[PDB]
Amino acid sequence: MEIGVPKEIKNQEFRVGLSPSSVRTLVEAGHTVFIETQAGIGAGFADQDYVQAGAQVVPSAKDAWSREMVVKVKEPLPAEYDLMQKDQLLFTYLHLAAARELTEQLMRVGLTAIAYETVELPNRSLPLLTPMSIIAGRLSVQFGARFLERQQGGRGVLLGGVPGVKPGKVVILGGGVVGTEAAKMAVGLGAQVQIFDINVERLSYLETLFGSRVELLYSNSAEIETAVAEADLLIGAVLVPGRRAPILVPASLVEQMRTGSVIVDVAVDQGGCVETLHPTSHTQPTYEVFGVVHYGVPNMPGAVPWTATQALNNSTLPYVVKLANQGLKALETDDALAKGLNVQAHRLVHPAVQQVFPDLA
Amino acid sequence: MEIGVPKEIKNQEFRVGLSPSSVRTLVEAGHTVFIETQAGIGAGFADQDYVQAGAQVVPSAKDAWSREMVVKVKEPLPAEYDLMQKDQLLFTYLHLAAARELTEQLMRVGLTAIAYETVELPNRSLPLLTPMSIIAGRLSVQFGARFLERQQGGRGVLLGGVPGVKPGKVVILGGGVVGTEAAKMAVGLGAQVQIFDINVERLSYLETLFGSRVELLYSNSAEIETAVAEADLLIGAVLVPGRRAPILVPASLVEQMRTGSVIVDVAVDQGGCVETLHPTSHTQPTYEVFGVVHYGVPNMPGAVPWTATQALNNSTLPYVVKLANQGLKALETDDALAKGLNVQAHRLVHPAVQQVFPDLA
Amino acid sequence: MEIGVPKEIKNQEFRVGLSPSSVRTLVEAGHTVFIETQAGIGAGFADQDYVQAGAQVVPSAKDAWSREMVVKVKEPLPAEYDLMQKDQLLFTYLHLAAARELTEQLMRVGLTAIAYETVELPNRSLPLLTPMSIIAGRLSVQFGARFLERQQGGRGVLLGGVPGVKPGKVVILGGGVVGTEAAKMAVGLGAQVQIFDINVERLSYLETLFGSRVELLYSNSAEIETAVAEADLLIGAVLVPGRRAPILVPASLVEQMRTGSVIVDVAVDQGGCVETLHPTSHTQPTYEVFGVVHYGVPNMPGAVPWTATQALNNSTLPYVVKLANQGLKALETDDALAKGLNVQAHRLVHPAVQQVFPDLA
Amino acid sequence: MEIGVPKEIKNQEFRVGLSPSSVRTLVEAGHTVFIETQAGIGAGFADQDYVQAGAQVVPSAKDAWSREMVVKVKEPLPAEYDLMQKDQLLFTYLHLAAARELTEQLMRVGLTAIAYETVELPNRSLPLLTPMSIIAGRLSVQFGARFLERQQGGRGVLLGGVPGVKPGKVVILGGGVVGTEAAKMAVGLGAQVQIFDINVERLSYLETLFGSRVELLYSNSAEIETAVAEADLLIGAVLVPGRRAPILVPASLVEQMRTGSVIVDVAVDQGGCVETLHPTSHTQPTYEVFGVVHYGVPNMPGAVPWTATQALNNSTLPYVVKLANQGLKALETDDALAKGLNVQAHRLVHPAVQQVFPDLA
Amino acid sequence: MEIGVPKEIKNQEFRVGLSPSSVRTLVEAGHTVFIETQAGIGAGFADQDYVQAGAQVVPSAKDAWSREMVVKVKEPLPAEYDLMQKDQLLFTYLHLAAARELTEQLMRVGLTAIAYETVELPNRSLPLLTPMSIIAGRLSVQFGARFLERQQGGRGVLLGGVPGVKPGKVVILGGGVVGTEAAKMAVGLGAQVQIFDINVERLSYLETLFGSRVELLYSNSAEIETAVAEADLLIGAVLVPGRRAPILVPASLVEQMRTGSVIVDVAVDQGGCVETLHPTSHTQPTYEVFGVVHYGVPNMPGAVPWTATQALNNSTLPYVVKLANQGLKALETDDALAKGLNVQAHRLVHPAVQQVFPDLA
Ligand SMILES: NC(=O)c1ccc[n+]([C@@H]2O[C@H](COP(=O)([O-])OP(=O)(O)OC[C@H]3O[C@@H](n4cnc5c(N)ncnc54)[C@H](O)[C@@H]3O)[C@@H](O)[C@H]2O)c1
Ligand SMILES: NC(=O)c1ccc[n+]([C@@H]2O[C@H](COP(=O)([O-])OP(=O)(O)OC[C@H]3O[C@@H](n4cnc5c(N)ncnc54)[C@H](O)[C@@H]3O)[C@@H](O)[C@H]2O)c1
Ligand SMILES: NC(=O)c1ccc[n+]([C@@H]2O[C@H](COP(=O)([O-])OP(=O)(O)OC[C@H]3O[C@@H](n4cnc5c(N)ncnc54)[C@H](O)[C@@H]3O)[C@@H](O)[C@H]2O)c1
Ligand SMILES: NC(=O)c1ccc[n+]([C@@H]2O[C@H](COP(=O)([O-])OP(=O)(O)OC[C@H]3O[C@@H](n4cnc5c(N)ncnc54)[C@H](O)[C@@H]3O)[C@@H](O)[C@H]2O)c1
Ligand SMILES: NC(=O)c1ccc[n+]([C@@H]2O[C@H](COP(=O)([O-])OP(=O)(O)OC[C@H]3O[C@@H](n4cnc5c(N)ncnc54)[C@H](O)[C@@H]3O)[C@@H](O)[C@H]2O)c1
């Protein structure tokens, strides 16, 4: 089939729909791929690498959008609304329940849109988001260490300390995928680490990973209060299915933290579990409240596009191949794929997006 | 005795001569300490903490400089030349072989100046520099990870990678104190690590620390060339006694590195082992040569003043106490202290500084 | 019941149906066991040990084959066709889909034959093969190290290297049971290790076992090519259910490998994932193609009969006991056992073997 | 200076005096190197690699022996006696106290001969032998595992066992360099390990390396007897300065060992600590006594010439460079080098070799 | 709702139904809690702590028993039979199949009684017992070490030994929750450890936790006999669903053990797997049979009430909250809770307790 890969146009978005290794694999399956020049450059892939792989490098987005299947990272923007085609297959992150205009647009056009984030296993797991959660967890500590540096606004604490001197104290709220990857890094830098979770069985499992090196604590307000007050680095990594996140950290608790301490709340979209936290810019990634540094920049994985592009591809690829092979019939063979389906032929198909635009259904 | 601690005035210097725990200890020994207001604040110590410790908080530097002993972090600046006194004891980092004017100043004044960096054991070890080498080694990786982020100018590589994706490759030139601490951090973040050294016995010792997790390689041009070409993060940590550092990495080698890769040369004063590296600012910590990011900001430990102040104190303290107790006679009891002596009563005493200002002796 | 254990007669087969500990256990359950003299000697078990266990040691195979139940390791050979009886229970590895004559023989005779390799759990797992996969994985590295020795034909590389010198590079294709055990050994010898797999969730799990000590890579032709070219030791450990193995390594790739490098493809029966690999002898376990040493000897576990006999027994025993107790009714109580049933009363019962000898059904 | 490297002619000797990386380094120092064609091929180095390094590849040994300095691995053989020159510098392993004829030959010729094995530090350490001890220690386990395989003559025991089955038991007599490297490998393969030593302080140090994973036992006849009787693999790694090795294992003890168990005595030249052990061939590396497999092949490191050549070079190189630079005056600057001196201008200089050929002095 | 917490009156019982953190959490949910004075003191919780949490501290048990819901640790005793009320909710450990009188009492009264130990998941797991199994496993080793001390009656063996001296040998029968926690501690003290289990898949899993540090052995009489004879510390940790425990250790085996060796059978209620073991007192926790020390004191977790109270609460809490919120309707929403139901309105509801008092149903 013909596969197009336009360059990402969203602000600060350096990832790319397909890496060269993916392309190669696709080309060996009988398919042909068209990629816009420079599409891969923010991620570290030259057009050259794409040609070596069997890609046809196209000079414009029009040329890339004109294919039967388009594979991207982010949702289409208004600047590209006119590039879309009636019978395309669009496979990318959509987040439709947050973009009515976008939802209507796809609807008018009549294509079929499959969202990475709705492809779901019986497991109830979302295989195409995980890779991003792993990365965010790892980055949280890296960003946190930077902001604990004096020139960056923090107290001037080295996470690992040095023999004779106290190490930094990292408190992680939530021991799921993100919280677990964060703990791995903090431990690697030498910090003293505490993880809170409400699921004891998850806590038991974490003990198999860390042994007695990390403190594994049941999530209750009383212990949270004490721990948070002593933290140099607080990482929010909580997720709850039927809703937005619980505020485990009220402004009053924040007020009790040490000056120059830092909070990184990875749970930014769904609210955060920290009361004083809101999303931040990039020309201004942080702000202070009570002398405590706040970091609320989202899509953390965008800081490592080379690593992030491959991680995503490793997971999307088999789906890309199935679609290229069976086209629309794959949704009838693949239940997970069938669940990624959001829009088709002017109809809003995803039940979740329906309950949000009940009048769009 | 009376001990004074002025606030550091050098640019970007947030450390402080004595921490509150040190002060307390000093006060319990019979001594009294005077500290300039706000002297400890960049390091995270309020005047309050100093008063609780037994310190007398003085409102001006004059008041702090007027003591029989002054304890600081950096060398005196011209702005303080008039504050110095004839019979003081000055204990701080001096680096006289690089400051003639300063050397002459101390000479005129007639005090006795003891340099942290010349206090030396029979071991030939410099006990008061080590703490700073440990910190620099640990920070190098932390800074390196930041600069490998796309927005910071790097390729966009996560050091630890994610299962399925290649981890970052870190190459460390020199397996001494700095190189060893750097390896500890890189390994902690999940990177693939290679350390080069010319001392096999040091390599053998490192194996006892890391096992087979790190690649331990003999330093020869041939292997260096190959390794460096594949690095995401290159850390220079070489030191050679009788001179400046060897250029293990010529511009030609740098030219062969991947775009967006980063070099952190901790060996900045003595030259660096990297040809294209020079010191950098803070309003501009890095620059590019061949698409490769260069970081040459010195006194790395200044980024974590809270941790760095305590590490230094843990080591200087026993010397501070000996001086306060025995005053000048300590140099006659302590050989290491006797070696820290640089200037006394208008005479240049340190042989090393003499061979540099042979006409000052 | 009466249980017989003949000595294995197949070439190079030193294992034995029951170890002495098994026998003891069987005897304490009310059963009696007859074993041919010397049956256990290749595995390190003297007849003495068998008598201490409660076994009756019989002088001939006839005496051992004449029992209501016979327990062996390998399939019956033509030399024993006349020893079989109409109503026996035969429990051993059969591999009928590869032995028509054998399949017809059991059919004529009219016994019931249960194959270790078809006993299967709902899990779809084959509990009686695993023990052999674990052993093969561990041996692969052991054999590989031997063949990397100069006198054995290899390049003369020590897997662990020595501080100052590069360790050997081991590449494992497939991260399942075999590939995982191989990685454990390679890591134990100090090698640099890469594992490829197409299942990301398996890759994630492996990270919980190895941390960042092993490189965990997604199986794609592009990365495979690069990795394989740099390998000292290549281990094939791929398995795919609905068929034979994929050739992940074409002769062209093999041609690009270093002279004296070695390939051990554990996936020998089902083809191998290496193009240039074919089964080898024992009077000649290896051969060279492009200066690269090939090892294709099967039934690797036969090299450690003492360890292999016990591992198998630990798993077969509970089934042996159930059969001795309930005889044929066990297949009606045990679904896994019911699945091991291949032949009974002249009829070919196993659906898998039926689809192979569709005219035998 | 001119440096020659002849091809090694001794039987089964595949190492080479200088690797290509060494050569390169030498060439960059102002020196020129001549190497006999194919000299590096048994170690995995093509002439090509030597030319790339700056070597001049010579067609004959005569051409290589004709230089002011010759660098080899083994001692000169009678076939090369005529190639030697009056004023050469010969640097290689000599073992003169075992070769009278050779000793006389060097004497006649009048060159100066420096033996790797006599270069000694104040430490009393022999820096140029260690690399070989490390390798032998690692290989011992590798060879031992092979001989425990049934087809190789052993009991058929997998060192690591499998969950549910006992691992192999490895007993190491001597916890020095060799014994320690052996333990590292055995532990890596999963074996149960015991190390005996008479030096408690060495035992204490080993605990810092292995923790409680290895049993660390004081060397006394009583415990030795018990342990040895239960071993699958016995490794002799004892060394005593003023003499030959103690027989810690009398034939009577050997008689008590399990059939198919194996003994690898790395202490072969100095006798061995095992009574029934003698050196073996290569066309016959082992023999049996009491059903116990004996391995007594020496120069174990010769099995991995690629790894062994580099390990040796990493250590000899700085000495090779000093000699090329200062020629004979290096012995007057280098005490360790001065100690390597065995023969010069017809005189036997090495005190140790003198006390052996008291009439040659 | 109103929640009461009486002080535990059973002998040697220091735990308490709710910890202060639990209380706080309950109070924030809209509920009010009444606790008898001193109820928390044996566990380390002052009334003060309870008041800070929002508890109302009541002076008598009557006051605590008079609530709509009573939360305790142990079963009600005759001394409290008169305190119970018709429509209460009683949530605590009951063990009714062992207390007929108690069972009849609850029956008369007409309350609804929910037993911690019958709350069960589809998993068939008993979430409210696990926490106690983990603790018992950890304590077993701690108690065992104490009894191996000479003054306590044991042989005088230090589990970890010291470099040069054999470590203690610990044998664990059963590799489930208890056996696994015991192994963790024994390994932590430096002992040589063997675990036996009949489930190979459990053995495989344990290898992922311990690697090759522990010996993982299949449970068969032959190996058990040998291992037990050499043990310093034997820990019984076997559980079998449809019955009482198997005697894996007959008195005859015990007779073969070393004098001063110790047995701790955690499997005390269900019999023990050790023939010579019976429950013991506290004024006499052990006894000897054949010079072997026996420890059979039950409810091991009672020795660490501070730790044990919190572990239990972490697990019971969510159930306590559900009950307080939905009262009786929770059993209709919660299947696990519905399974904890033993008695209600004079009727015996639990099928298991019915089959024991078939005439009570
Ligand atoms: N900013 C970014 O780039 C980015 C990327 C990915 C995910 N995230 C966010 O990070 C969060 C973590 O996602 P995840 O994949 O780890 O989910 P997860 O389900 O793997 O982990 C969440 C964990 O939180 C625990 N939790 C829930 N309530 C809790 C409570 N009251 N106290 C303590 N722990 C509680 C759960 O028991 C669970 O273990 C989500 O909110 C997600 O949206 C941000
Ligand atoms: N910028 C900062 O804030 C800061 C702070 C401290 C130290 N440093 C610098 O960092 C360097 C490292 O200091 P250190 O305490 O680790 O010294 P060290 O002696 O502990 O380590 C240096 C090591 O380099 C090795 N080395 C020398 N020549 C080599 C060669 N050709 N190849 C490979 N390795 C070689 C030596 O064998 C030694 O092991 C010095 O140059 C020091 O001035 C910078
Ligand atoms: N010679 C012997 O004595 C012996 C003994 C046992 C097994 N074997 C063979 O070894 C192989 C391994 O068996 P196992 O028990 O490990 O199976 P397994 O299922 O546990 O492992 C196989 C793994 O291969 C992976 N795989 C499949 N296709 C792949 C691809 N294209 N790239 C990379 N990985 C891929 C799967 O995802 C899986 O994780 C089989 O072929 C089996 O027949 C040989
Ligand atoms: N065959 C080969 O290729 C080869 C290569 C190198 C070394 N070797 C030999 O291996 C031996 C080991 O050499 P090394 O470098 O380990 O020496 P080492 O000094 O590092 O180790 C020897 C150790 O043996 C211990 N020892 C001495 N007497 C003992 C006794 N009665 N019981 C127990 N331990 C005792 C010492 O305390 C010491 O720790 C030597 O005999 C050497 O000649 C063979
Ligand atoms: N005294 C106390 O305070 C206390 C507290 C909790 C549990 N216990 C007791 O401890 C025992 C262990 O409980 P658990 O939670 O570990 O159960 P579990 O199911 O987690 O562990 C029991 C294990 O025993 C194994 N096993 C069964 N039969 C065996 C045999 N013949 N040989 C070897 N292993 C065998 C099973 O395969 C299983 O892995 C139970 O009997 C329980 O009643 C005592």
Largest interface: A-B, 46 and 46 residues
Ligand inventory reads: nicotinamide-adenine-dinucleotide
Please write the CATH class name of the largest domain in chain A.
Answer: Alpha Beta
Rg of chain A is 22 Å
Number of structural units classed as domains of chain A: 2
Number of helices of chain A: 12
Could you tell me the number of beta strands of chain A? 15
Distance between the termini of chain A: 31 Å
Query: Can you tell me the CATH architecture of the largest domain in chain A?
Result: 3-Layer(aba) Sandwich
PDB class: oxidoreductase
Keywords: oxidoreductase, NAD
Entry title: L-alanine dehydrogenase complexed with NAD
Chains A, B, C, D, E: protein (L-alanine dehydrogenase)
How would you describe what is shown here?
This is part of a larger assembly, with five copies of chain A (361 residues). With 361 residues, chain A is α/β, with parallel strands linked by helices. Chain A folds into two domains: 185 residues, 3-Layer(aba) Sandwich (Rossmann fold); 176 residues, 3-Layer(aba) Sandwich (Rossmann fold), CATH 3.40.50.720. In chain A, the strands form two sheets. Chain A has an eight-stranded mixed sheet, sandwiched between helices. Chain A has a seven-stranded mixed sheet with strand order 9-8-7-10-11-13-12, sandwiched between helices. Bound molecules: nicotinamide-adenine-dinucleotide (NAD) (5 copies). The site of one nicotinamide-adenine-dinucleotide has 32 residues of chain B, from α5, α6 and β8. Chains A, B, C, D, E: One of its GO terms (molecular function) is nucleotide binding. Chains A, B, C, D, E: It is an enzyme of class 1 (oxidoreductase). Chains A, B, C, D, E: One of its GO terms (cellular component) is plasma membrane. Chains A, B, C, D, E: InterPro entries: Ala_DH, Ala_DH/PNT_CS2, AlaDH/PNT_N, AlaDH/PNT_NAD(H)-bd, NAD(P)-bd_dom_sf.
